[PDB]
Amino acid sequence: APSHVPFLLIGGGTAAFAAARSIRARDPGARVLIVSEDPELPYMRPPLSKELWFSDDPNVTKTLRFKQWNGKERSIYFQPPSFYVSAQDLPHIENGGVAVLTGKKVVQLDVRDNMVKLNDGSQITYEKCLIATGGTPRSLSAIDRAGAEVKSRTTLFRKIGDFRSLEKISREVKSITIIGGGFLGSELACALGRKARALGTEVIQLFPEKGNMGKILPEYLSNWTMEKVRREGVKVMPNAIVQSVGVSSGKLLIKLKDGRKVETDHIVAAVGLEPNVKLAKTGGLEIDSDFGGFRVNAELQARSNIWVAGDAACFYDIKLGRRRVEHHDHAVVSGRLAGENMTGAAKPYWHQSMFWSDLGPDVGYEAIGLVDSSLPTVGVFAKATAQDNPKSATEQSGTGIRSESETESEASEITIPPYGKGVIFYLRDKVVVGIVLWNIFNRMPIARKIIKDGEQHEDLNEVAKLFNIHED
Ligand SMILES: Cc1cc2nc3c(=O)[nH]c(=O)nc-3n(C[C@H](O)[C@H](O)[C@H](O)COP(=O)(O)OP(=O)(O)OC[C@H]3O[C@@H](n4cnc5c(N)ncnc54)[C@H](O)[C@@H]3O)c2cc1C
């Protein structure tokens, strides 16, 4: 570990990588150190629950290369390992570079001193610091009460190391249970379900809601989604609240509050995240008590020379106010912006971050703004053409990272032109405050503009025609 680095990026995920890239774009002599508690160099998370499981290629667990839905291979890593310089070389190497200290954790932050201390005792001073620590998976309290035998047979799915362990479990055991009905839980259900159809084994998905993604999607589409996951072979148990987990026979026994017993060999928990804010206390840094995460100003600053980006940040959304998100898009754009600000840009974060999820190559969702199933919603559906699927969208764009194909921009203008797919408008009064797109692609710029303008929209059916017609 060097003693000092001009740019110190704490955490080695998506936000950290985008900030490193941005810093080096604006200052090509810059010396950037990423400190990553994981053994792996920076990598994107979306394939871990999607294309890596759909690959029929051997070796996938070793190589972490995946085929997109269009059949083109891509690495999980943001860049080849050859592109980084060594941490030892970074302070003096000609033209600077980006180094990663892997397997190291920042445990203390000294803001007054512009210094951090690592788990190994090392001290690093900085000029400009980014906190991009992401978040930690939530447990289920019934699992924490359970024996050591239960805990060792529970995966909190989040990293490469979890893909590798679970993929092997999937080939060894007869039954895996996913707890959580959210996008990630549902992705993993389809993933494991596909492998289990091959092996003749069992996959269960359980959650308290009436259908998959029940907190976000309206009842019709949530149920549709549950049927789709069931068509994959998965036993989906909605209305399921876990009372306890123990052991009975040679199995884990999950007892639901309603009396149902579920027997299984392994549990995967996908019940959300908590931002990694441990450094706030030594730092004296403000955390948002309502939403979680480090509070940041318009420019993503927590202090004059500390920025925060990605899952860890609680920022003021241009239209929603204070919020935190768990969006790949946000981690990329806020990371990039934080890097620009670290190099003097003084730019505010005005981005409206999008989210996507794929349940295999034939089903895709996108979301933007305030998407909460308890709001009044208006769904406008149409029938799918051959191109209304994540596969075609990947084929047209060359990428399956939907935030790249959609673009980050908002449309210039909205003027109106005089089920398998659709748009769901989420309303506050009769203002569209959020939108979900189901099998509709390359219209995020439009959805951003509709939410941004915040006009009253009486006839949402005319507005829907922007989504339901060809792109095109
Ligand atoms: C399996 C999975 C699938 C997903 N799929 C999608 C998707 O399809 N679409 C979508 O929009 N989003 C998706 N997401 C969400 C998206 O990946 C996250 O929003 C994104 O990773 C956030 O990036 P980040 O840099 O803020 O945090 P991360 O990428 O989580 O990186 C944070 C890093 O910092 C490290 N760290 C934490 N504390 C310290 C410390 N004190 N010292 C050193 N290192 C530290 C952590 O180990 C971690 O590596 C998915 C997430 C997961 C887990």
From Swiss-Prot:
Modified residues (N6-acetyllysine): 261, 452
UniProt cofactor(s): FAD
Cellular compartment(s): Mitochondrion intermembrane space; Mitochondrion inner membrane; Cytoplasm; Nucleus
Recorded consequence of changing residue 358 to A: Increases protein dimerization at lower NADH levels
Post-translational modification: Under normal conditions, a 54-residue N-terminal segment is first proteolytically removed during or just after translocation into the mitochondrial intermembrane space (IMS) by the mitochondrial processing peptidase (MPP) to form the inner-membrane-anchored mature form (AIFmit). During apoptosis, it is further proteolytically processed at amino-acid position 101 leading to the generation of the mature form, which is confined to the mitochondrial IMS in a soluble form (AIFsol). Ubiquitination by XIAP/BIRC4 does not lead to proteasomal degradation. Ubiquitination at Lys-128 by XIAP/BIRC4 blocks its ability to bind DNA and induce chromatin degradation, thereby inhibiting its ability to induce cell death.
Compositionally skewed regions (Polar residues) per UniProt: 386-402
Placement of covalent cross-link Glycyl lysine isopeptide (Lys-Gly) (interchain with G-Cter in ubiquitin): 128
Coiled-coil intervals: none
Impact after mutating residue 233 to R: In DFNX5; uncertain significance
E.C. number(s) listed in UniProt: 1.6.99.-
Effect caused by changing residue 402 to A: Increases protein dimerization at lower NADH levels
Main location, first listed in the record: mitochondrion
Chemical reaction(s) catalysed: A + NADH + H(+) = AH2 + NAD(+)
Residues the entry annotates as binding NAD(+) 1: 181-184, 209, 215, 272, 326-327, 356
Phosphothreonine carried by residues: 394
Enzyme class: oxidoreductase
Involvement in disorder: Combined oxidative phosphorylation deficiency 6: A mitochondrial disease resulting in a neurodegenerative disorder characterized by psychomotor delay, hypotonia, areflexia, muscle weakness and wasting. Some patients manifest prenatal ventriculomegaly and severe postnatal encephalomyopathy.
Assembly and oligomerization: Monomer (oxidized form). Homodimer (reduced form). Upon reduction with NADH, undergoes dimerization and forms tight, long-lived FADH2-NAD charge transfer complexes (CTC) resistant to oxidation. Also dimerizes with isoform 3 preventing its release from mitochondria. Interacts with XIAP/BIRC4. Interacts (via N-terminus) with EIF3G (via C-terminus). Interacts with PRELID1. Interacts with CHCHD4; the interaction increases in presence of NADH.
Protein's name in the database: Apoptosis-inducing factor 1, mitochondrial
Residues of the whole record sequence present: 128 to 613 of 613
